[PDB]
Design a protein around this ligand. Structure first.
Ligand code: FDE
Ligand code: FDE
Ligand SMILES: C[C@H](CCC(=O)O)[C@H]1CC[C@H]2[C@@H]3[C@H](O)C[C@@H]4C[C@H](O)CC[C@]4(C)[C@H]3C[C@H](O)[C@]12C
Ligand SMILES: C[C@H](CCC(=O)O)[C@H]1CC[C@H]2[C@@H]3[C@H](O)C[C@@H]4C[C@H](O)CC[C@]4(C)[C@H]3C[C@H](O)[C@]12C
Ligand SMILES: C[C@H](CCC(=O)O)[C@H]1CC[C@H]2[C@@H]3[C@H](O)C[C@@H]4C[C@H](O)CC[C@]4(C)[C@H]3C[C@H](O)[C@]12C
Ligand SMILES: C[C@H](CCC(=O)O)[C@H]1CC[C@H]2[C@@H]3[C@H](O)C[C@@H]4C[C@H](O)CC[C@]4(C)[C@H]3C[C@H](O)[C@]12C
Ligand code: FES
Ligand code: FES
Ligand SMILES: [Cl-]
Lengths: 359, 359
């Protein structure tokens, strides 16, 4: 039996091996939805080859590459098997992986989606919190596809563009946090500082009105509420890159700063990206961690697990697709509003694309 | 009969008349908990004198002054009256007004709380979201007082240092928003953009690790969930003041930007300060409102009411004190953690002051 309802899972993806790094950065620095540079078509191929060594080193430090493709597939299969039982009417359900910077590319997934002749297609972002640089770009890619190809869609599109506070997403964070808290000495458990750490954004993106900072902040509050504020916490921002101003406090500074002030037990929480990724300076570079413990007497710096393959996550995914199908909405109301200082002509077009879909 | 349980309502206060503007600014720029300047004791008087004209002008544009004292008394009386019934064991209760920069000063209130012979004092901040420059300074003032009169408290202190998501606070916001939405033509309601507007913080305070932006974001999300995301929204920051970088987007530029992009109906919501204050450029300056109205034809720009006299607010204030008293907590868990990059040695002393209190 042919597939009825297709679920396109959107993410930036990641280099499978250190060999895939160059082409990851290449596509990344070419993404005008993410950034605009002078003579970009020529500077991109450069910067990519230029930073490849550095990025290659960082991925080596965490296993040799990104496991996103595998976790997404395993999560997708778990979502589908549950979707076939939850909503018989829209079954069979089939999932497609739509990575932005590496194969299987977004356009490739759409292209294949068109061929299987689906009745309904769902652009399901894998970023719980919305940013024009993440979800925005993935959704813009879909619009850019049909327009670069020159023809209209042959299936009904809709989208789950954000889910910063989905009750089952919150339950998974709380569970992973409790699980890691148990790894600290029993007599220090209540002194542990929970440090929520999300990827920073350049202030120029924040200042034009990106909704990301506000949604990440909302996820954090729901998690602490579920945990009944058992420990103190802070929302900090990691991996800023370059010399320009980025939203702080930086995770690096915060850990050092916190240690210089007596807090020896820290629990980092990946609150805005659901799969493993590049870690922070004090977790990786061993030379810096020594100086740290030698002066501040750092006791424990731990990191909660990523929602990788927790089966309770698949239940979160399927529950979202199910609700979406039952509500008949084409996108959240937040998507109908562009950033106050948006200067990307494609944003409006992508918006209209989804609000204008049939059914 | 004498007062048993005293409730100290903390806030920055405000100039009652245009004549009280100088001393207000004076005490403000002298606040070391708010900002640190070189030879501050000399520079403060100058800055205060140099800005009084502009601030007097601003307050005149809104009626000639701030009504914070009157509204706080009203809410205070309503809170006390409701407590005496909710908590008979701690009754009778008495509210005191502790403004930071104008009479009745924080110190004046504490000094009077002693004389009344209270056997319990509650430092209750009127800012739902915590910032070191707001609630932090007012709490630091309580510690700075006893550390001046060289003596110790004759009563037991405790504090309600934050309440960003108190359910009755959320209901009030949603009620005022719905009520204001009705003032727009009904054929345009669903298109009204809800602009939550909170006072900005300098980027140096944000990067230091101030919890304010994350708590304000939490209030926003709670309010929108309560309204069913009936309209699109954005959290923006107002009253920048100065040349240095502050957290954006700025309310002024967001309104201009939103209008330049076809969003004609905007609803402004004062989400982080519960009483009337200085408004934005497009609400005051008539020269700008016109340019805006004709360069990009804006239809309606309205501001929801401040949670001034709404009785449901008094009920929120009372429900908080009651819950606080029955939980037996001395402060929130969050107060036990200082900012990652704190450089104010008084902060941790203020912390110990509250966590070390009897019972
Ligand atoms: C401008 C910008 C913005 C943004 C945003 C963001 C968000 C919201 C999220 C995110 C993410 C990310 N990224 Fe992001 N972002 C950016 C960027 C970037 C770059 C450039 C890169 C590559 C690396 C280097 O250094 O080069 C990235 C990248 C990135 C990735 C990979 C990395 C790691 O670390 O792992 C991640 C996952 N990013 N992101
Ligand atoms: C640095 C800083 C920080 C901060 C924060 C804050 C928050 C969180 C909240 C707030 C508030 C306020 N303020 Fe604030 N702040 C600041 C500041 C300031 C100043 C300088 C002033 C006076 C005015 C002028 O211009 O000078 C103020 C001020 C202020 C007041 C008065 C105004 C109006 O607008 O009305 C208000 C209410 N503040 N705020
Ligand atoms: C000027 C432009 C930013 C323009 C803008 O923000 O509006 C910035 C962004 C990318 C930068 C370039 C990239 O960082 C790659 C190169 C880095 C070298 O250290 C300087 C030359 C170099 C070629 C940079 C020149 C210049 O600083 C660029 C081109
Ligand atoms: C960090 C990287 C340069 C790396 C390198 O030279 O090795 C530089 C080059 C292109 C830069 C970006 C582009 O200049 C476009 C944006 C310009 C804004 O002022 C900051 C964010 C912004 C998104 C920049 C972030 C950062 O400074 C980038 C990404
Ligand atoms: C140098 C000092 C900041 C020191 C520090 O951060 O460690 C800053 C903060 C307050 C500033 C002063 C205030 O802004 C008041 C004046 C403003 C004028 O535009 C310049 C002179 C002026 C007198 C400023 C001189 C200088 O930039 C000051 C004194
Ligand atoms: C706006 C005001 C000067 C007003 C005037 O000259 O008429 C200046 C003088 C003191 C300055 C503050 C002080 O320099 C202390 C802080 C320094 C940080 O770098 C920015 C925020 C910070 C809080 C400054 C905000 C703003 O630039 C202030 C408040
Ligand atoms: S950059 Fe946010 S809608 Fe275009
Ligand atoms: S500045 Fe935040 S605790 Fe001191
Ligand atoms: Cl829009």
């Amino acid at each position: 039996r042919k597939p009825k309802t297709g679920i396109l899972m959107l993410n930036m993806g990641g280099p499978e091996t250190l060999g895939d790094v160059h082409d990851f950065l290449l596509r990344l620095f070419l993404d005008r939805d993410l950034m605009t540079l002078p003579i970009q078509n020529k500077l991109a191929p450069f910067i990519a080859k230029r930073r490849t060594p550095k990025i290659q080193e960082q991925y080596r430090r965490i296993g040799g590459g990104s496991p996103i493709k595998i976790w997404t597939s395993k999560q997708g299969e778990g979502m589908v098997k549950l979707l076939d039982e939850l909503s018989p009417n829209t079954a069979p359900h089939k999932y497609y992986i739509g990575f932005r910077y590496v194969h299987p590319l977004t356009e490739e997934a759409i292209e294949e989606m068109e061929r299987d002749g689906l009745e309904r297609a769902i652009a399901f972002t894998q970023y719980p919190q919305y940013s024009c640089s993440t979800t925005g770009s993935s959704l813009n890619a879909i619009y850019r596809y049909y327009n670069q190809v020159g023809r209209k869609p042959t299936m009904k599109w809709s989208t789950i563009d954000r889910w910063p506070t989905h009750h089952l997403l919150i339950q998974c964070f709380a569970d992973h946090i409790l699980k890691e808290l148990d790894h600290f000495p029993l007599e220090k458990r209540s002194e542990v500082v929970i440090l929520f750490s999300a990827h920073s954004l350049p202030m120029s993106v924040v200042n034009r009105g990106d909704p990301y900072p506000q949604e990440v902040s909302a996820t954090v509050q729901k998690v602490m509420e579920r945990l009944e504020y058992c420990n103190p916490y802070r929302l900090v921002w990691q991996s800023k890159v370059g010399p320009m101003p980025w939203l702080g406090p930086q995770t690096d500074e915060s850990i050092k700063g916190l240690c210089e002030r007596g807090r020896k037990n820290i629990l980092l929480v990946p609150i805005a990206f659901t799969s493993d990724h590049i870690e922070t300076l004090y977790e990786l570079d061993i030379e810096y961690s020594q100086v740290l413990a030698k002066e501040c007497g750092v006791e424990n710096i731990r990191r909660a697990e990523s929602l990788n393959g927790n089966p309770l996550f698949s239940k979160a995914l399927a529950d979202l697709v199910h609700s979406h199908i039952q509500s008949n909405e084409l996108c959240s109301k937040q998507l109908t509003l562009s950033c106050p200082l948006c200067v990307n002509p494609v944003c409006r077009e992508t918006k209209s694309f989804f609000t204008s879909q049939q059914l």
